[PDB]
């Protein structure tokens, strides 16, 4: 299946967000990220994707779609906007191995604060 992402400027969570942050998918599964409002894009955090996984990055303004394999949880950045929390969760298939992993590793605070809100 495919799972349609939005990137905008604003949305319910503040200013550069992910619409939807929080993403359930299976592997075969297409996420489709969509720049509604220009200056977005969608990159993998280093040591933040599945054992296994390849590393990605769009380019700005574009649309992207990506295939998921690997079962796991994905933490992607919008490279412009990381540090003001533009941040999605993938969770591949069921209890992602690498979830405290990730909740516990090193980033900025108010990304940090986004994440919680997203698990929750
Ligand atoms: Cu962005």
């Known amino acids: 299946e495919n799972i349609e992402v939005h990137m905008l400027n604003k949305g319910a969570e503040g200013a550069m967000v992910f619409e939807p942050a929080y993403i359930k998918a299976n592997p075969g599964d297409t996420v489709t990220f969509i720049p509604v409002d220009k200056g977005h894009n969608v990159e993998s955090i280093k040591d933040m994707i599945p054992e296994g996984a390849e590393k ?46 990730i909740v516990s590793a090193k980033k900025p605070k108010i990304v940090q604060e986004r994440l919680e809100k997203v698990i929750a």
């Open 56 to 101: 990605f990055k769009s380019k700005i303004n574009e649309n992207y779609v990506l295939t998921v394999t690997q079962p796991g949880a994905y933490l992607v950045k919008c490279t412009p906007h990381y540090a003001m929390g533009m941040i999605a969760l993938i969770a591949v298939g069921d209890s992602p191995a690498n979830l405290d992993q």
